Structure 1
Amino acid sequence: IDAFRLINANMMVLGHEPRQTTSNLGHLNKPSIQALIHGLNRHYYSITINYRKNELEQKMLLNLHKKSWMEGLTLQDYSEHCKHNESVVKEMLELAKNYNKAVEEEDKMTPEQLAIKNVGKQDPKRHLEEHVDVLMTSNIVQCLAAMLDTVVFK
């Protein structure tokens, strides 16, 4: 955004600076250099804006955009969830073998050097705490939702 409005080029010949600042409210936003290449500030000026929000509109767009209907009251493909519970763990073994590798070449060349040098091949340590978040929220959400169906549905 940043709407603009012209300034007279008559005052440019006079060398006179317009708009006679009486409040510390105008010079808050800094103009971009690419707009400063153009006619700002020799032919037009910026104007600070805000937005008119109101509760007549605010609530009726928040509570209506992303509402999940009955998704978490499901079981998520019950033969395949435990199948996917091995589709991660199997390569998580070998990704821990890398974690059984990368720790072993420490007390070595000053691990700031182990920051530059590890941009070619994958590391365990970040990738290994990755799947643990995946292998938890996929399990804890699915195990809990199974045990609320047993009470509510008879």
Structure 2
Amino acid sequence: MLLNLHKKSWMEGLTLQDYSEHCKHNESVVKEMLELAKNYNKAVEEEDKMTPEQLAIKNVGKQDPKRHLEEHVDVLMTSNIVQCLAAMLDTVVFK
């Protein structure tokens, strides 16, 4: 129980509230951080398209990679929060 007591941090406060608070915000101002994430898309990936050409110049890996890997895949995991929790609206709104 004391294990789950501190697990309330990363899981949820009540195991209900905090991710029902993720149903409170729920994309809300959460697209603002998606706009900053898509600004991280433009920022990081405009210098990520400079990497493979340079790899052809220096022939090839400088070890490297810049990493500049993963990242916004996690933003797409928040998109899994988008699709799931918004699919709950069909259950919330209807009966």
Q: TM-score range by the shorter chain?
A: under 0.3
Are the structure 2 counterparts of residues 152 and 102 from structure 1 closer, same or farther at C-alpha, using a change threshold of 3 Å? Answer: closer
- Equivalent-residue separation in structure 2 for 1:150 and 1:69 (angstroms): 26
Larger radius of gyration: 1
Structure 1 residue ranges, 4+ long, deviating more than 6 angstroms after superposition: 60-73, 111-128, 137-154
Report the structure, 1 or 2, having the larger helix content: 2
Give the SS at the match of 2:32.
helix
Higher mean displacement: 125-134 or 92-101: 125-134
The Cα offsets for residues 9-29 of structure 1, whole Å up to 9 and x where unpaired, read as xxxxxxxxxxxxxxxxxxxxx
Structure 1 unaligned segments of length 5 or more: list them. Answer: 1-59
Q: If the length of structure 2 is used for normalisation, what is the TM-score?
A: 0.28
Structure 2 unaligned segments of length 5 or more: list them. Answer: none
User: Percent of aligned pairs with the same residue?
Assistant: 100
Aligned alpha-carbon RMSD (Å): 8.6
The Cα offsets for residues 5-53 of structure 1, whole Å up to 9 and x where unpaired, read as xxxxxxxxxxxxxxxxxxxxxxxxxxxxxxxxxxxxxxxxxxxxxxxxx
Query: C-alpha displacement at 1:82, in angstroms?
Result: 0.7
Are the structure 2 counterparts of residues 115 and 143 from structure 1 closer, same or farther at C-alpha, using a change threshold of 3 Å? Answer: same
Are the structure 2 counterparts of residues 140 and 100 from structure 1 closer, same or farther at C-alpha, using a change threshold of 3 Å? Answer: closer
Q: If the length of structure 1 is used for normalisation, what is the TM-score?
A: 0.21
